[PDB]
Amino acid sequence: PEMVRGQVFDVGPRYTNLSYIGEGAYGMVCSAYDNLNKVRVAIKKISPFEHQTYCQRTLREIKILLRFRHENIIGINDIIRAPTIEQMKDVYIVQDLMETDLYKLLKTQHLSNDHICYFLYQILRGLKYIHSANVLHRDLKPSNLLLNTTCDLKICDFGLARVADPDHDHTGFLTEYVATRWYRAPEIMLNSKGYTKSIDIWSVGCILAEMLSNRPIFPGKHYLDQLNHILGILGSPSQEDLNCIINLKARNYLLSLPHKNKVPWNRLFPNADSKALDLLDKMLTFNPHKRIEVEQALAHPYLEQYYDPSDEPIAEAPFDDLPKEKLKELIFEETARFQP
Numbered sequence: 001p002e003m004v005r006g007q008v009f010d011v012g013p014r015y016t017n018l019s020y021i022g023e024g025a026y027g028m029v030c031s032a033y034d035n036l037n038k039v040r041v042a043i044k045k046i047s048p049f050e051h052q053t054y055c056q057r058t059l060r061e062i063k064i065l066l067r068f069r070h071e072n073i074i075g076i077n078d079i080i081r082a083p084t085i086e087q088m089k090d091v092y093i094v095q096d097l098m099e100t101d102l103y104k105l106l107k108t109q110h111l112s113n114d115h116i117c118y119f120l121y122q123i124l125r126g127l128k129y130i131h132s133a134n135v136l137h138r139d140l141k142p143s144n145l146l147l148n149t150t151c152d153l154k155i156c157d158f159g160l161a162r163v164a165d166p167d168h169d170h171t172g173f174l175t176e177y178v179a180t181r182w183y184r185a186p187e188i189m190l191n192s193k194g195y196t197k198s199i200d201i202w203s204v205g206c207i208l209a210e211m212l213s214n215r216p217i218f219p220g221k222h223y224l225d226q227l228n229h230i231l232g233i234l235g236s237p238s239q240e241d242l243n244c245i246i247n248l249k250a251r252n253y254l255l256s257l258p259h260k261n262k263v264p265w266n267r268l269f270p271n272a273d274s275k276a277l278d279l280l281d282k283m284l285t286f287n288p289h290k291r292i293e294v295e296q297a298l299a300h301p302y303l304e305q306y307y308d309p310s311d312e313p314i315a316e317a318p319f320d321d322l323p324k325e326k327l328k329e330l331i332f333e334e335t336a337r338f339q340p
């Protein structure tokens with residue numbers, strides 16, 4: 001097999017001339033030449049089969065992406081693995097080769113307002129499709145937003161996605177959570193399992209703020225610090241928003257804090273477009289019930305240049321305890337369509 005950085009990267013003979021390009025959850029990403037389609041592609045190596053949670057994440061992403069088809073979601077072009085379960089130790093996912101991602105771009109590039117607007121439009125266009133399938137991405141952040149050379153944007157990594165379940169969203173205070181800390185909505189720390197669509201809108205609001213200044217807006221250093229950062233900018237929640245938190249431990253934690261005033265968005269972002277800041281405010285609303293929804297965000301005046309509901313498609317239909325052995329079997333079966 002062809003080898004990359006000491007590790008097998010066994011994708012030939014169709015895919016050759018491999019170069020390291022990035023990191024996925026359970027393996028490296030390489031670029032490669034596709035000898036059939038005569039183009040270079042990206043390939044993610046996945047080695048999940050030792051760990052049950054890894055196999056869960058792998059299977060759920062494959063299941064979702066094999067159903068989804070959208071311009072702003074990076075699809076699965078091919079899946080490579082051994083012909084038998086016994087011989088299958090890794091799985092490789094082949095996807096479009098993008099030029100960069102927004103994490104990399106924000107490290108060194110100032111975005112024009114026109115770029116910010118177009119990026120945000122595309123994020124919300126893809127998110128409209130995801131949410132219309134009753135799916136939550138749950139880990140939106142700059143490194144999951146890939147860009148090609150003409151700044152077309154695609155959302156990556158559905159390994160943390162779930163079907164929305166708003167009736168079962170409530171939990172206790174300081175409940176453990178998996179998705180990336182800086183993009184977590186305040187309710188995650190207070191009373192939410194992250195099972196409603198508003199979780200993703202919060203993350204998009206954080207991404208918009210980060211595009212405006214090239215700095216994460218809420219860079220918390222640990223679990224409860226994340227809430228410190230959010231409240232330091234939004235200010236203390238209103239009585240009405242507190243009354244919506246029935247859990248006593250969460251409510252009383254908030255009541256124990258000194259009063260904090262809101263920091264105006266145009267003080268934080270003095271060069272930003274005023275319409276962008278109005279939309280930012282509605283995405284970074286403390287109360288998730290009051291937070292703007294994706295279709296409302298698309299219709300916001302900041303996005304008027306691009307908004308066109310007839311060109312913002314939706315999904316044709318809505319979308320544990322399983323030992324890794326059944327899950328390896330399920331991954332084998334889910335990937336069978338790409339074999340000869």
Ligand SMILES: *[C@H]1CC(=O)[C@@H](O)[C@@H](O)C/C=C/c2cc(OC)cc(O)c2C(=O)O[C@@H](C)C1
Pocket residue numbers: 021022023024025029042043044074095096097098099100101143144146156157
């Ligand atoms: C997308 C999700 C991820 O795994 C995430 O970690 C991503 O940031 C890693 C980047 C992968 C990558 C990098 C380049 O660099 C030029 C180009 C492409 O196309 C990709 C890519 O497609 O990532 C997919 C496989 C995972």
